Design a protein around this ligand. Structure first.
Ligand SMILES: NC(=O)C1=CN([C@@H]2O[C@H](COP(=O)(O)OP(=O)(O)OC[C@H]3O[C@@H](n4cnc5c(N)ncnc54)[C@H](OP(=O)(O)O)[C@@H]3O)[C@@H](O)[C@H]2O)C=CC1
Ligand SMILES: COC1=C(C)C(=O)C2=C(C1=O)[C@H](CNC(=O)[C@H](C)N)N1C[C@@H]3Cc4cc(C)c(OC)c(O)c4[C@H]([C@@H]1C2)N3C
Length: 177
């Protein structure tokens, strides 16, 4: 069917942000020309899913430039949060299965991009709803920070592809189960 994919950038110790929710280690790093183009991945996406912390990061850091206007967007939270009334943004909560079929439908046969973050990704994985991961790994350790996938127990994956870029960053596709 349609794939729920976790496409994310992470440190070598498996963190997707500093403990203060900063991405200096990420944004200050030049992936290089030989990286897989962002567009080529985003072309395969028909919906995005997010937790509320990642939503608030994007709105505080790019308030006038929502990046996913091209697709519907589902933000999970237990608040009655509000989006600018002009943006394709829905707020859902609870069981991760219902959210996935809602998002897979809206994706129209394209994939659902689980942008994150960790807590949200783990909710889906614990529910057996996460099917693939695409990780860009930055050659750095930050010691502590936001965990990429805080699952409750060991989630094993099959390595389906891996590239090492000229800059030291790496890319891999992981299939769940
Ligand atoms: N480096 C990268 O490539 C990426 C980095 N990031 C970073 O990750 C950080 C945040 O990741 P994280 O800290 O894991 O927080 P999340 O982004 O996972 O948001 C977590 C929140 O989502 C809500 N939520 C999750 N599951 C459910 C559910 N089943 N039902 C209802 N609400 C739910 C809750 O919000 P509430 O409290 O509202 O209930 C929870 O606190 C941010 O700093 C972001 O910038 C994000 C994506 C990729
Ligand atoms: C592949 O390597 C990745 C690198 C090198 C990255 O910089 C980033 C990622 C990578 O995967 C991925 C997604 N890739 C993306 O290209 C877009 C930004 N979504 N990201 C997910 C998001 C959403 C977002 C949004 C905005 C507006 C950001 O402002 C720039 C931003 O930094 C971020 C980021 C981060 C950026 N978090 C919060």
């Amino acid at each position: 069917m349609s794939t729920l994919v976790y496409y994310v950038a992470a440190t070598l110790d498996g963190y997707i942000a500093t403990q203060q929710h900063k991405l200096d280690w990420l944004e200050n790093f030049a992936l290089g020309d030989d990286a897989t183009a962002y567009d080529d991945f985003y072309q395969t996406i028909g919906a995005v899913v997010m937790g509320s912390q990642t939503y608030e990061w994007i709105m505080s850091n790019a308030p006038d430039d929502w990046p996913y206007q091209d697709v519907p967007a589902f933000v999970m939270s237990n608040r009655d949060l509000s989006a600018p009334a002009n943006l394709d943004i829905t707020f859902l909560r609870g069981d991760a299965s219902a959210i996935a079929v809602r998002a897979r439908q809206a994706a129209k046969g394209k994939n659902v991009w689980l942008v994150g973050g960790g807590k949200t990704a783990a909710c889906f994985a614990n529910a057996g709803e996460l099917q693939q991961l695409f990780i860009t790994t930055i050659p750095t350790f930050i010691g502590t920070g936001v965990p990429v996938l805080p699952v409750d127990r060991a989630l094993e994956v099959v390595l389906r592809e891996q590239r090492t870029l000229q800059s030291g960053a790496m890319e891999c596709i992981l299939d769940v189960k």
